Design a protein around this ligand. Structure first.
Ligand SMILES: Nc1ncnc2c1ncn2[C@@H]1O[C@H](COP(=O)(O)OP(=O)(O)OP(=O)(O)O)[C@@H](O)[C@H]1O
Ligand SMILES: [Ca+2]
Ligand SMILES: [Ca+2]
Lengths: 20, 337
């Protein structure tokens, strides 16, 4: 499921921005 | 009438934009208690203000780190804008000041914690629950946009929940006062509009896309475009192909197709009717826009709170002592702060 793929991903914690 | 409201709101803002508040407190006026969250060039701490006894959230920015990440103008932006705005769902800046080493922004403490934590914890929000939040963001973007301000950092990790369960938007680190287009590559990958990714130059419609990602993530429990590394996120975003959970309503799906629209000429919030296409969409039909602004709507979730200094709605963080050099750092750079 998409859920399970998300939860197993490396991006389920607080996400950091990007910038210059 | 919005028009009359927005016009006096702009008059108010411009007065402060033009003559910004400066140096309205000092470090030894507060006792620093606990780190509420960390960031790129500093940390935010729960603090107690000695003379009043009030709790606040003190955002502490290491000037040197700001410079090293090339965020000077953005930081001046952040502070100049936050001291001038005023809206029920924008966090209030109570004090600001600087010393040899750091920049400080002292805000109202929003003790509910991040939307982020409750979202991940509960898993996902019901459509009524997500709709209550989304409405607050829609009104906030209407306000900000009308001041020529673009926010550029919408995401659950920046939306705080207050004691009444309403949202408080925080972190104006990327907010900018601009007429017409801008180019900085900034934001969070999952939330970037395709025109940001393709380096075209863009306008406030990137905030309406971000709202689309937000509403999806709130309602789904995961974002519409995710992968292990941003490059793959970027391809997915640029595709614009979006799939929806089986539980999404038809109304929700329609709205999301119009917000996560790669085509600016089609994207809701950016057409001729502007925000009213969003306010008038079927998904929002049960939304009482005035009652929300006036905060008269019962919130669907009310954070547990005990004592004005309770931080149980926040993750714990490693603590580090706040060092202030005997030598002034980056004095000229930050003169106007
Ligand atoms: N007014 C506030 N009340 C309570 N908590 C706060 C407040 N402002 C910020 N925080 C907490 O601190 C965290 C970091 O704040 P902020 O987003 O402003 O940091 P930052 O220095 O801009 O770092 P980054 O941009 O990398 O996130 C927030 O997500 C929240 O957990
Ligand atoms: Ca942030
Ligand atoms: Ca920031």
């Amino acid at each position: 499921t998409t859920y399970a793929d998300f939860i197993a991903s490396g991006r389920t914690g607080r996400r950091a921005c990007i910038h210059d | 009438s919005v028009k009359e409201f927005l016009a006096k709101a702009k008059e108010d803002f411009l007065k402060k934009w033009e003559t910004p508040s400066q140096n309205t407190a000092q470090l030894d006026q507060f006792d620093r208690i606990k780190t509420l969250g960390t960031g790129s060039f500093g940390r935010v701490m729960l603090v107690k203000h000695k003379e009043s006894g009030n709790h606040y959230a003190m955002k502490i920015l290491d000037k040197q780190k700001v410079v090293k990440l090339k965020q000077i103008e953005h930081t001046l932006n952040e502070k100049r804008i936050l001291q001038a705005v005023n809206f029920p769902f924008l966090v209030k800046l109570e004090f600001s000041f600087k010393d040899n080493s750091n920049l400080y922004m002292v805000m109202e403490y929003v003790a509910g914690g991040e939307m982020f934590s409750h979202l991940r914890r509960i898993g996902r929000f019901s459509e009524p629950h997500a709709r209550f939040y989304a409405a607050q963001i829609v009104l906030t973007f209407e306000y900000l946009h009308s001041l020529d301000l673009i926010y550029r950092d919408l995401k659950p990790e920046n939306l705080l929940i207050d004691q009444q369960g309403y949202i408080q938007v925080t972190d104006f680190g990327f907010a900018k006062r601009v007429k017409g287009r801008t180019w900085t590559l900034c934001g969070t990958p999952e939330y970037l509009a395709p025109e940001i990714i393709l380096s075209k130059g863009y306008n406030k419609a990137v905030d309406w896309w971000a709202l689309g990602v937000l509403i999806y993530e709130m309602a789904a429990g995961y974002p519409p475009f995710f992968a292990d590394q941003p490059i793959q996120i970027y391809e997915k975003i640029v595709s614009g192909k979006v799939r929806f959970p089986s539980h999404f309503s038809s109304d929700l799906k329609d709205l999301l197709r119009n917000l996560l629209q790669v085509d600016l000429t089609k994207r809701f919030g950016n057409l001729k009717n502007g925000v009213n296409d969003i306010k008038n969409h079927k998904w929002f039909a049960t939304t009482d826009w005035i009652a929300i602004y006036q905060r008269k709507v019962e919130a669907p979730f009310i954070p547990k709170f005990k004592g004005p200094g309770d931080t149980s709605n926040f993750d714990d963080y490693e603590e580090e002592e706040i060092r202030v050099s005997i030598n002034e750092k980056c004095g000229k750079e930050f003169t106007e702060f």
